[PDB]
Amino acid sequence: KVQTDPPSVPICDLYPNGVFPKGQECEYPPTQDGRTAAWRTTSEEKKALDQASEEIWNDFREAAEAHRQVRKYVMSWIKPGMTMIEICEKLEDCSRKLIKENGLNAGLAFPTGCSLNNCAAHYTPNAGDTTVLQYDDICKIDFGTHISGRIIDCAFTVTFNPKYDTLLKAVKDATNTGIKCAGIDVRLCDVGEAIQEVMESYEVEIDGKTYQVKPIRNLNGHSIGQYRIHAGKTVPIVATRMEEGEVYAIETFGSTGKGVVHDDMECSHYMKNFDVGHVPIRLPRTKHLLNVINENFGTLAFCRRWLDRLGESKYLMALKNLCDLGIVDPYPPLCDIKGSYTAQFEHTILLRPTCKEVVSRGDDY
Numbered sequence: 001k002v003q004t005d006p007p008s009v010p011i012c013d014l015y016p017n018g019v020f021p022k023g024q025e026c027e028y029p030p031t032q033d034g035r036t037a038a039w040r041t042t043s044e045e046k047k048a049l050d051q052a053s054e055e056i057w058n059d060f061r062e063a064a065e066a067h068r069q070v071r072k073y074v075m076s077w078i079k080p081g082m083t084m085i086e087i088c089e090k091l092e093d094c095s096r097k098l099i100k101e102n103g104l105n106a107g108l109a110f111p112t113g114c115s116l117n118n119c120a121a122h123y124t125p126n127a128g129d130t131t132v133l134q135y136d137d138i139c140k141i142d143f144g145t146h147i148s149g150r151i152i153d154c155a156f157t158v159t160f161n162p163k164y165d166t167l168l169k170a171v172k173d174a175t176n177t178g179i180k181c182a183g184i185d186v187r188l189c190d191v192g193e194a195i196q197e198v199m200e201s202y203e204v205e206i207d208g209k210t211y212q213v214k215p216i217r218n219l220n221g222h223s224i225g226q227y228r229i230h231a232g233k234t235v236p237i238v239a240t241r242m243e244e245g246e247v248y249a250i251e252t253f254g255s256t257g258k259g260v261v262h263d264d265m266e267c268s269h270y271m272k273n274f275d276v277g278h279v280p281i282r283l284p285r286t287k288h289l290l291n292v293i294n295e296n297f298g299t300l301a302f303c304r305r306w307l308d309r310l311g312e313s314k315y316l317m318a319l320k321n322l323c324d325l326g327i328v329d330p331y332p333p334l335c336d337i338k339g340s341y342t343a344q345f346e347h348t349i350l351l352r353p354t355c356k357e358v359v360s361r362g363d364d365y
């Protein structure tokens with residue numbers, strides 16, 4: 001079976017034997033005295049440990065292949081004039097089809113981020129949002145797919161005006177640097193230090209004004225767990241080590257502002273607190289909403305549009321109650337200072353026993 005234009009054929013139909021394309025495979029970086037970790041590629045113990053988890057790597061690969069094909073389609077049509085709603089809906093429709101959405105077993109890991117300009121992350125339009133993408137907008141397209149809770153967290157930046165070209169190059173270079181420096185036993189702060197050094201080596205000129213690119217210091221890479229976008233380990237931009245079999249989202253954000261984000265605009269993103277156990281609720285609308293969240297999202301993220309599409313209404317008080325109780329957490333848009341510009345690049349990497357796999361790498365980024 002071959003992929004259509006626009007893509008509509010599910011990834012598992014293009015690979016009937018259920019063996020999915022590998023991402024970019026890298027030898028681990030050498031240590032401090034220059035002693036390589038190349039031995040991992042040829043170690044018989046490492047190869048058996050790697051094959052024991054083949055089903056897992058395979059679920060990430062299917063999810064990454066859906067991500068590559070969805071984002072390639074998005075890049076062909078994304079244009080100024082389109083509303084943010086139209087963009088998110090058109091992307092998500094393709095995403096659901098290619099991942100072959102099936103409850104909590106296959107689907108969308110989190111809402112389509114499409115944060116604009118000074119806003120770096122966690123903006124997706126709510127119903128009634130009339131925001132239209134502009135020619136001068138710098139749009140961060142951040143969307144996730146998953147197979148059995150093996151999440152692909154991968155993002156890029158869309159622009160139409162070439163004035164942002166050197167800002168995108170800085171961030172792409174800083175993300176690629178973090179990915180190169182990542183490895184088994186590598187300290188998280190060393191990855192962060194390498195990211196910062198490359199990011200700050202760039203100076204950009206946008207509309208007659210110059211800036212030394214700043215990494216957003218409170219927006220960081222992170223470990224990924226099953227049905228858990230952020231598994232608790234962070235890649236900080238400045239003791240904890242990356243470990244074998246761990247999965248990371250290596251993301252960087254460059255800014256012309258303060259290089260610090262703050263909560264701004266109305267909330268659209270939400271996610272159940274991963275650690276919260278069963279909570280008995282009698283309040284009818286609050287009980288019903290939590291049952292909708294548990295059935296459709298579990299510990300995966302969602303947005304208000306995803307509640308609207310399920311036929312839910314008059315849920316705002318019910319959602320505020322879940323947030324007040326600490327069952328669900330709101331994740332509002334994260335914005336740098338007014339008038340600033342932010343860019344982002346992100347990949348998902350598998351720290352396999354034999355090698356580092358940039359599973360979401362494409363021919364695009």
Ligand SMILES: CC(C)Oc1cc(N2CCNCC2)ccc1-c1c(C(N)=O)[nH]c2cc(F)c(Cl)cc12
Nearest residue numbers: 110111153219222229230249269270271301302331
């Ligand atoms: C930038 C911060 C605010 O992001 C997070 C922090 C936590 N924290 C849990 C509590 N402990 C601190 C970390 C958990 C998840 C995310 C997150 C990410 C991600 N980091 O890439 N992407 C997301 C997509 C979404 F739709 C939603 Cl709702 C949440 C996320």
Ligand SMILES: [Mn+2]
Nearest residue numbers: 142153154155
């Ligand atoms: Mn992301």
Ligand SMILES: [Mn+2]
Nearest residue numbers: 153249251346
């Ligand atoms: Mn992330």
